[PDB]
Amino acid sequence: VQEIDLGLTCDMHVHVREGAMCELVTPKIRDGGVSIAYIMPNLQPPITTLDRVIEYKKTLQKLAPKTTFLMSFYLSKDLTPDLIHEAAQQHAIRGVKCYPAGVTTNSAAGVDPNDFSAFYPIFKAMQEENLVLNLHGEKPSVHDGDKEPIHVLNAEEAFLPALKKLHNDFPNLKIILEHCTSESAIKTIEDINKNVKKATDVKVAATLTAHHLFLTIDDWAGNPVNFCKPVAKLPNDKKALVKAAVSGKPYFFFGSDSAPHPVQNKANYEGVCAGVYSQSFAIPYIAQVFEEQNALENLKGFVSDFGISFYEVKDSEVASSDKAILFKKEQVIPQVISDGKDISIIPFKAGDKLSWSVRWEPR
Amino acid sequence: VQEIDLGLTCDMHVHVREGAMCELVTPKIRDGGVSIAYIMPNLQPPITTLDRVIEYKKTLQKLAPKTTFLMSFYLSKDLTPDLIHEAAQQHAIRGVKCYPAGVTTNSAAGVDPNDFSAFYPIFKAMQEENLVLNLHGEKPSVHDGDKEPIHVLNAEEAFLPALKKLHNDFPNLKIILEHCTSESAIKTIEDINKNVKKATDVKVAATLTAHHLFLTIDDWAGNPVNFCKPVAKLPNDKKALVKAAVSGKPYFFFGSDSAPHPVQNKANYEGVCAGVYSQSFAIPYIAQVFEEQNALENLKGFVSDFGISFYEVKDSEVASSDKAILFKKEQVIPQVISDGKDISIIPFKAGDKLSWSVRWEPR
Ligand SMILES: [Zn+2]
Ligand SMILES: [Zn+2]
Ligand SMILES: [Zn+2]
Ligand SMILES: [Zn+2]
């Protein structure tokens, strides 16, 4: 087309950090074409208290009055079932996010995905409250010499039995395999949802980032800016991710995992911080893929309908009724995104032409 | 043991660069325990002329009077059969190194490995002069949308048909698949050498680096200091390289691919230079592998006997008869190696303890 009404757009995997970085990035949610954002909890320290999660959103809302913020707790032994019920009651959180220990940013204070039993009381409460369980689905890497090797290329596949058990022990709970990167994970999600037909049946879904629809291992091998977790994988994996994203199936929907880092935390000779920054042009990135796939008819489901449906986003929570309007005027992605002070971020696909822009119209 | 006499040690894959970097690194050849070095030609601009290869060697000999230097040309369209004959007849080179275009440091002037026949007059002259054809055996990446894609993980496997065709078309030409990184390559070299046992029968050999005996993809994913070409691959590949290095087979011998870069060329958000710096502790790094594999009796073959046999190094070429003595004194690898002025290099396994040290015995 040349103008597409995406309605209330949906980015269900957002990192905005804190401090000067957050002031720079949260207004970019709306700027990249996103009305509703699900905010991830891996701050330093993690978000595990009620007052933190409440004030964090107030800080966010002040920065972005027209952005709807859905919040989350960082899965943790700190949490209690009481904190869960007390938070779902006051509608302070809409889900809880699990980070396996060591596999990504600010995950050191994370959990071990081999003994999930210690958190079954937490999922117990979460299920009763219809809260979402978000999973960074990678097993930690394993050296040893006895048990089968786990590395960055198969850590997501090795996590897939854990996902299935969690689904089989909490069958009413809403679970999301965040940012899928492998054909194996796509196939697992499609099998778990084999008998779904419309749509509110889905209880296990997967988010797909913008960058994993573009990247393979070649793009990050000598390019830390394209390094994130889970890493982009083989060409066959990308094909499956793209096919899923444009499939029109209600169990795949957009989650950017926009993960902002100052440029000096990417230009390291060791300990490069994982993460791609896509917030500034979130929807235009996804538009490009759907255009090239001749499937622009499925864009609205992927970037709006399916996440709204799965998260059950009701009209009474949306901060602004403005519609996101995609229109086919080319823009150039800048080389850097700066706050004029101490923050420079390199955006995903810095310097590239995008065919689409996005603006806001009232309902 | 305590103390092992390795004799005249060989590193048949050495980068020493130019200028201040070369003044820092070439004395480290001896320091890391290596008597004989095969000097790669991927300078800027590459070594493709007789005068430059002779002048380079003089520089190197002045920096390191006890080190034996074997030189090479960079395979390029500027080379002619007359020049091959002239360089051979002047004892100015021992081989010619092929870089497929785009796959590694200073390879933009390299070749198209789907059009090797354009270089058959060169190989013919090399065969007649008993020179060595060294191959950086990786196919350039093709992501394509046509036939099966090439990426950094399979680029070496994708190159193996070209190696077999070269050996089949020039059966008397000595060919080295440099720095093997994949089990598939190991199997291909073993199969080409099916009916060899000792040693002058070997026509196609492979070098193995120090770092590929330690590294997997998990070690460089977020660590540019460990990023090299060909990239370190899966646990199963590393296992097969280690087993090859301690094999005692005459068609595997040591080539460090020590590839020094200043620290600022590693700490980049894009365009990280490929290369691991291992020269300063080359022999001790290998000793650690052979000790852990209960294979110390095979060490002298892998790091001395087999390279000398394959390159036919004669006692009249040797710059010093000093013998390398490995002795089991602990040492720690520094965090950084500097010339005191503008160059800092991060060495392989910076900060780790090694069990062995190497010294020189005059003979
Ligand atoms: Zn994640
Ligand atoms: Zn994330
Ligand atoms: Zn190479
Ligand atoms: Zn090399």
Total number of domains of chain A: 1
CATH topology term of chain A: TIM Barrel
Q: Give the biggest beta sheet of chain A.
A: 6 strands, parallel
Number of helices of chain A: 10
Provide the spatial order of strands within the biggest beta sheet of chain A.
Answer: 5-6-7-8-9-10
Strand content of chain A: 15-25%
* CATH class descriptor name of chain A: Alpha Beta
Greatest interface and its participating residue counts: A-B, 28 and 32 residues
Helix percent of chain A reads 25-40%
The distinct ligands, each listed once, are: zinc ion
Rg calc of chain A: 19 Å
CATH homologous superfamily heading of chain A:
Metal-dependent hydrolases
Query: Could you state the order of secondary-structure elements of chain A as H and E?
Result: EEHEHEEHEHEHEHEHHEHHEEEEEE
- Give the second-level CATH assignment, the architecture of chain A: Alpha-Beta Barrel
Bulk shape of chain A: globular
* Count of strand segments of chain A: 16
**SS class of chain A:** alpha/beta
Oligomer: homodimer
What is the end-to-end distance of chain A?
21 Å
PDB class: hydrolase
Keywords: Dihydropyrimidinase Dihydroorotase metalloenzyme, hydrolase
Assembly: dimeric
Entry title: Crystal structure of Dihydroorotase in complex with malate at pH7.5 from Saccharomyces cerevisiae
